Design an enzyme around this catalytic site. Structure first.
Site, PDB file in Angstrom:
ATOM      1  N   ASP A 166      -5.847   6.355  -5.235  1.00 47.29           N
ATOM      2  CA  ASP A 166      -5.354   4.981  -5.330  1.00 47.29           C
ATOM      3  C   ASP A 166      -5.393   4.446  -6.773  1.00 47.29           C
ATOM      4  OD1 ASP A 166      -8.074   4.106  -5.841  1.00 47.29           O
ATOM      5  OD2 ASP A 166      -8.228   3.068  -3.956  1.00 47.29           O
ATOM      6  N   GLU A 180       0.779  -1.251   0.000  1.00 44.18           N
ATOM      7  CA  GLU A 180       0.000   0.000   0.000  1.00 44.18           C
ATOM      8  C   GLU A 180       0.810   1.300   0.000  1.00 44.18           C
ATOM      9  OE1 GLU A 180      -3.056  -0.042  -0.742  1.00 44.18           O
ATOM     10  OE2 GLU A 180      -3.809  -2.009  -0.170  1.00 44.18           O
TER      11      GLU A 180
HETATM   12 CL    CL Z   1      -1.939   2.551  -2.136  1.00 41.04          CL
END
Ligand code: CL
Ligand code: R1B
Ligand code: CL
Ligand code: CL
Length: 164
Positions: free
Chosen positions: A20, A11
């Site tokens: 994202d 992440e």
């Molecule tokens: Cl991310």
């Protein structure tokens, strides 16, 4: 290696609101804020999450706080789900982390829907499970990350995360 270190690799860490892989406003260690295209909606979600009027910017400590909550929420989500709990219970610690990883990224409902993959995992047919998991929007949209998670399910080792 452990679930926190694994997800931290997958992440990243960003202290300012960013979009994202799906174009959704996110912050910290993959903390999804909202699917809304409104930056103001995302900022409101952030303020509520942190408990203060942010400027769309958080500290490392705040990012890690949300991360802890999110990992805990993923585990809680697995354990409360009738489809995911038996698979999780049947797995070793390394593969449990791979399942938590998937839940963190796509949510309890999303992962619970992988009926065929879940069955193969429960059956411990690792290569078969690995091939089946790759036949997904998940794999196609985030192939490097999915490859790492899949390798983790296939081998029950952290080999996909060692050079990282
Ligand atoms: Cl991310
Ligand atoms: S997991 C993907 C694979 C497929 C589809 C074939 C049959 C080509 N394989 O040999 C693998 C098991 C690598
Ligand atoms: Cl939250
Ligand atoms: Cl990827």
């Amino acid at each position: 290696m452990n679930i926190f270190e694994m997800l931290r690799i997958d992440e990243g860490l960003r202290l300012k609101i960013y979009k994202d892989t799906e174009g959704y406003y996110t912050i910290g260690i993959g903390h999804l804020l909202t699917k809304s295209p409104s930056l103001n909606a995302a900022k409101s979600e952030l303020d509520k999450a942190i408990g203060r009027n942010t400027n769309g910017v958080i500290t490392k400590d705040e990012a890690e706080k949300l991360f802890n909550q999110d990992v805990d929420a993923a585990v809680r989500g697995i354990l409360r789900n009738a489809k995911l709990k038996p698979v999780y219970d049947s797995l070793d610690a390394v593969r449990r982390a791979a399942l938590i990883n998937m839940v963190f990224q796509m949510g309890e409902t999303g992962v619970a829907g992988f009926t065929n993959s879940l069955r193969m995992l429960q059956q411990k047919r690792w290569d078969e499970a690995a091939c089946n998991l790759a036949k997904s929007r998940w794999y196609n949209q985030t192939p490097n990350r999915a490859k790492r998670v899949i390798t983790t399910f296939r081998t029950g080792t952290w080999d996909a995360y060692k050079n990282l």
